[PDB]
């Protein structure tokens, strides 16, 4: 679900980037409230995420091939399709009757993707899904030969569609380099509601600002709340305002005609105790965008597994379940502790 | 403190009442309990929404898991007292009966219309069944449900919800198994658009503002909050229930020492809107009668070691 | 892609007003400001979902492999 921004520059229309949307207008509260959002970490409302907030989907194409290793003139040694001997018959639950998978099935690590019946070994063989992430199947193409006949379907191309829901550890950002990691998904009953009932979507810490000095992100939250209420979009090219006509005196004036606070503050109650908070806090509408580098492409765990042949050590992995490293700098730290039994 | 010292002072005062929303005050109750009613209506009050979607065929351009998700967020008009609670212990032999589930179905194919006027654009009269709405979900009774739901049928509460869009050659065919659930497990079971409160604002004036400045004092509020009584010509509070408190007077230097702004701190103006299943006054009785049953169930378990 | 059913922040059922918004914006020839409040979008959490929506499904439908072009 892409969205067009409210606070857009005027080259958003003349370059035509509304055809390719990048983000979603989140309702951002600047508050330190949970204690889970310190040091560049953010909080996503759970009952906004479970209405599809930044839902993503990663496609991935593998080309199943058996025209390799063929030595340039040989007969078609292996064919697609099922054989005639015994084969364990739960292959038929996921493969169609030509050795190609049913479109839309749910594959895991271990399910088959094609069943090619050999001839020089006389057996109904199989090819398996290798990655550990449960994917579906969106499209299968039957690529034919550009040269002459050779016509036993030697090249097939499968495309898997992988679900990517916003987890804990998924980077987000604003349009101002406020790159942060989602640290917990907060239940919507525990969020600070407002005097009109709008719990936030994203809570960002106020300690992020005074060392980075992103005062664009303070004006963007005013021009979003002023732009949503009167239903207009706001111009935000550089160098249209100056010292006399500041934007907080301009975008604050549109807020005052709408019956809100001129400084962008809202009186907001707490969620756990129920009492009114001390200061009127500062909400707005800031166009976020979801980064890649999901957490699922990052973690790695090994207990025992595939080793190297020369030195009997584990392999360089994340795809082969290989160990991490204990370098020459982690070796000099383990002596400095005085622990010579963690070194051995 | 005692309950008779609570029963005498407590006072509910309903302002308005519709079939979609409700506004009623609660005077003289603690914030630990008025907040306890707000967290129950959102999180723990059961309602009905489709948990499982079985895809026979889908060749549309919207992929399957998004279309499965967009069905889950449609508010059905099933009274949730009418069903019973599914048991997540058994396999499918004893999971779904005629008392847990409600079966919905959807079957749409789309093909070209040869009576198209030339150069037309709108796919209401350029294709046949190109917009799959939410009213195309058909109720399928299984078991004793033909006698039970014969009075009121399963209709989605807002029927024009757009689920998909189709072009010739394409078809959707699925089945949905709607169950009971509380809003604390997934956000599609919460039977409430929003449910908040707010303490009643309190405007008190210290020095009696008069004249042209009192006319300049009135306009820093919504119209109807602050009045100017003729005769004495001093500004007086008509009602602060209309106050939308924004601290407009504190931006003015010549009013910042005449007005203090505060709350009443036991005067909770609730405002309950419903998502579509139930009446707004029926949710507030369900939140009170759940906190009573959350105590009574705790009162009878024995306290082990 | 398509208009979302529920609004993200509050939870109000907002997915059905999209064609009735594009009707009021075309036939009665209003602005974007009185059109939204006519449908009953009184907050600004549900108000931005209709207002800033890009209906990108209409570009995805033209690439259709089940009909000869």
């Amino acid at each position: 679900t892409g969205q067009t921004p409210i606070v857009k520059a005027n080259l958003y229309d003349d370059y035509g980037m509304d055809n390719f949307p990048n983000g979603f207008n989140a309702v951002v509260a600047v508050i330190s409230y949970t204690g889970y959002d310190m040091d560049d970490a953010m909080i996503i409302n759970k009952s906004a995420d479970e209405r599809g907030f930044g839902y993503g989907t990663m496609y991935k194409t593998e080309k199943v091939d058996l025209a390799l290793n063929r030595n340039r003139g040989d007969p078609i040694t292996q064919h697609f399709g099922f054989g005639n001997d015994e084969w364990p018959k739960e292959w038929l639950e996921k493969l169609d009757e030509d050795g190609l998978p049913y479109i839309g099935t749910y594959v895991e690590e271990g399910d088959p993707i094609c069943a090619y019946f050999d001839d020089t070994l006389n057996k109904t063989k199989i090819k398996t899904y290798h990655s550990s992430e449960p994917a579906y199947i969106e499209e299968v193409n039957l690529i034919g030969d550009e040269s002459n006949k050779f016509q036993e379907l030697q090249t097939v191309s499968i495309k898997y569609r992988i679900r990517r829901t916003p987890q804990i550890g998924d980077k987000f950002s604003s349009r101002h380099g406020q790159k942060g990691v989602c640290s917990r998904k907060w239940p919507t009953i525990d969020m600070p509601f407002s005097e009109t009932g709008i719990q936030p979507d994203i809570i960002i810490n106020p300690h992020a600002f005074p060392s980075r000095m992103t005062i664009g992100m303070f004006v963007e939250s005013l021009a979003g709340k002023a732009g949503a209420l009167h239903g207009i979009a706001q111009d935000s090219t550089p160098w249209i305002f100056n010292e006399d006509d500041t934007p907080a005196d301009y975008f604050g004036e549109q807020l005052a005609k709408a019956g809100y606070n001129y400084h962008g503050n809202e009186p907001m109650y707490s969620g756990a105790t129920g009492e009114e908070l001390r200061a009127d806090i500062y909400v707005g509408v800031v166009y976020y965008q979801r980064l890649r580098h999901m957490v699922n492409d990052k973690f790695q765990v090994r207990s025992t597994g595939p080793v190297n042949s020369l030195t009997m050590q584990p392999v360089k992995g994340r795809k082969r379940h290989g160990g991490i490293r204990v370098g020459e700098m982690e070796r000099d730290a383990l002596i400095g502790h005085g622990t010579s039994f963690l070194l051995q | 403190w005692n309950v008779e010292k609570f029963k005498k002072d407590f006072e509910v005062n309903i302002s308005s009442l519709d079939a979609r929303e409700a506004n009623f005050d609660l005077i003289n109750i603690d914030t630990s309990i008025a907040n306890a009613f707000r967290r129950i209506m959102i999180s723990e009050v059961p309602s009905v929404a489709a948990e499982y979607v079985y895809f026979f065929n889908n060749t549309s351009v919207i992929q399957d898991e998004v279309l499965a998700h967009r069905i889950g967020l449609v508010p059905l008009k099933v009274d949730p007292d009418m069903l019973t609670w599914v048991d997540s212990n058994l396999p499918d032999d004893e999971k779904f009966t005629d008392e847990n589930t409600i079966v919905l179905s959807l079957n749409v194919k789309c093909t070209r219309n040869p009576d198209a006027p030339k150069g037309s654009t709108d796919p209401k009269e350029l294709y046949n069944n190109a917009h799959v709405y939410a009213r195309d979900l058909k109720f399928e009774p299984q078991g004793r449900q033909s006698t039970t739901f014969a009075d009121c049928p399963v209709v989605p509460a807002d029927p024009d919800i757009l689920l998909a869009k189709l072009r010739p050659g394409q078809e959707i065919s699925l089945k949905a198994h709607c169950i009971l659930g509380i809003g604390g497990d997934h956000a599609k079971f919460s039977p409430v658009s929003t449910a908040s409160y707010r303490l009643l604002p309190q405007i008190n004036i210290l020095q009696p503002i008069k004249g042209e400045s009192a006319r300049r004092f009135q306009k820093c509020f919504p119209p109807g909050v602050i009045g100017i009584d003729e005769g004495s010509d001093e500004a007086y509070v008509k009602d602060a229930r209309k106050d939308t408190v924004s601290r407009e007077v504190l931006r003015y230097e010549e009013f910042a020492d005449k007005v203090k702004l505060g709350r009443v701190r036991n005067h909770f103006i609730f405002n309950v809107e419903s998502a579509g299943a139930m009446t707004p006054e029926e949710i507030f009785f369900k939140s009170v009668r759940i906190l009573k049953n959350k105590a009574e169930y705790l009162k009878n378990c024995p306290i082990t070691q | 892609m398509i208009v979302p059913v529920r609004c993200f922040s509050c939870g109000k059922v907002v997915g059905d007003k999209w064609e009735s918004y594009l009707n009021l914006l075309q036939e009665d020839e209003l602005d974007e400001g009185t059109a939204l409040s006519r449908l009953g979008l009184k907050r600004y959490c549900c108000r931005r979902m209709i207002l800033t929506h890009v209906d990108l499904i209409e570009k995805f439908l033209r690439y259709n492999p089940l009909e000869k072009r």
């Binding site: 207009i232 006509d245 709408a258 | 119209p223 209309k242 | -």
Partner: peptide, 24 residues
């Protein structure tokens, strides 16, 4: 240098929760 012009013709788009457009 001319100012960024005022968007003109606005009205109250936020009322108290229980009050509406015609009351004011």
């Amino acid at each position: 240098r001319k100012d960024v012009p005022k968007v003109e013709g606005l009205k109250l788009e936020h009322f108290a929760t229980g009050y509406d457009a015609e009351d004011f």
